[PDB]
């Protein structure tokens, strides 16, 4: 009954724009990190206060914000074709 309105409230979360992934390189200081998007441009940007120490990493894939380009949460990877190689028997 009320589960439909729950999906309607999920559409309000769908209004949020997706962020842009990137690959970190190294760090100049704690306030300056060098990240490189999959597209190839590099950005020295600041970071927000909600992240943790696991964000730093030695060049691990991260996602960049759409404005400050700060890293919110790092996604490990994504692969479309993998499932077609999973089914061999």
């Amino acid at each position: 009954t009320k589960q439909y309105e729950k999906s309607e409230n999920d559409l309000k979360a769908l209004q949020s724009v997706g962020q842009i992934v990137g690959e970190v390189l190294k760090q100049l200081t704690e306030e300056k990190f060098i990240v490189k998007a999959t597209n190839g441009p590099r950005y020295v940007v600041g970071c927000r206060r909600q992240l943790d120490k696991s964000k730093l990493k030695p060049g691990t894939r991260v996602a960049l914000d759409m404005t400050t380009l700060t890293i919110m949460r790092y996604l490990p990877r994504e692969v479309d074709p993998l499932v077609y190689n999973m089914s061999h028997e």
Partner: protein, 55 residues
Amino acid sequence: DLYSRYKKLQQELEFLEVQEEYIKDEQKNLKKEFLHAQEEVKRIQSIPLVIGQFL
């Protein structure tokens, strides 16, 4: 006549005496305004930035 100018000449004397605190108070303000201008140029651009290669 010589006492006349003797009563005239201390005017610009005292007029430049108040011109001492004129500049000295003005220049220190502007100095603090120039130190405030140092925070300006250091504020720009803050974040974010993009990497580039010097030629």
